Amino acid sequence: AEKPKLHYFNARGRMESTRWLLAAAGVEFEEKFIKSAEDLDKLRNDGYLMFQQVPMVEIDGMKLVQTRAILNYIASKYNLYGKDIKERALIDMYIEGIADLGEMILLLPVCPPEEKDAKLALIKEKIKNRYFPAFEKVLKSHGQDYLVGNKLSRADIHLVELLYYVEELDSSLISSFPLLKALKTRISNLPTVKKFLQPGSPRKPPMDEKSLEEARKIFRF
């Protein structure tokens, strides 16, 4: 069948959570990297970006845009979205909290230099007092290896991905959350995830200053 094709910059950005989910699901995919404003213009002018933005993923005959639409489809297609409407409600609640926190961290590099320190301190405060306690509480409530249904779901993948980003920010933030640490280890040892974390996979590195200032001028943000 058609192999999914991921259109995005050669960077983490708003495509990385899709790379994680597909890799975790054991699904082969291809990437088509946007290297210039001309590359992006061609996708727009040819009509393949509904809202003139990437990410865009070609899958099952669709040219899907909007990260949440892409992830929702992939999760359902590969049975990572729970078994019933109520499990999806828990999954959605969990992963939307993850996306809120992930959004903050995703946009810190583009923070005005004078608002940087305050923004970072707020992110760390919410991690220690709001989000990490919330997910530790879920894991402690049922004591099982997975967030929902005693079965791997997108929620485990999205959360562990975020845990790696929180580690990059500050290794100490997770220190008082032993169940989150255990989740990170177990999920990282799943064969598909273990391979994705090893070198040479589609997993992308953190944005460096040299690469940011480059695409910053090339793509007008």
Swiss-Prot record:
**Example GO biological process:** glutathione derivative biosynthetic process
The UniProt pH dependence field says:
Optimum pH is 8.0 for the isomerization of androst-5-ene-3,17-dione.
Q: In which tissues is it expressed?
A: Liver.
Transit peptide keyword on record: no
Q: Which residues bind glutathione?
A: Y8, R44, Q53, V54, Q66, T67
Output one GO MF annotation: glutathione peroxidase activity
Family matches, as InterPro entries: Glutathione-S-Trfase_C-like, Glutathione-S-Trfase_C_sf, Glutathione_S-Trfase, Glutathione_S-Trfase_N, GST_alpha, GST_C, GST_superfamily, Thioredoxin-like_sf
The impact of changing Y8F is: Decreased isomerase activity
Entry EC number(s): 2.5.1.18, 1.11.1.-, 5.3.3.-
Task: PTM N-acetylalanine: list the residues.
Answer: A1
Activity control mechanisms: The isomerase activity is inhibited by S-methylglutathione (GSMe).
Q: Where in the cell is it found?
A: Cytoplasm
Give the UniProt family note: Belongs to the GST superfamily. Alpha family.
Task: Supply the domain comment.
Answer: The C-terminal domain may form a component of the hydrophobic substrate-binding site, but in contrast appears not to be directly involved in GSH binding and is not absolutely essential for catalytic activity.
Q: What PANTHER family does the annotation carry?
A: GLUTATHIONE S-TRANSFERASE (PTHR11571), GLUTATHIONE S-TRANSFERASE A1 (PTHR11571:SF107)
Q: How does this protein assemble?
A: Homodimer or heterodimer of GSTA1 and GSTA2.
Q: What is this protein called?
A: Glutathione S-transferase A1
* Organism, as annotated: Homo sapiens
Q: What is the lineage of its organism?
A: Eukaryota, Metazoa, Chordata, Craniata, Vertebrata
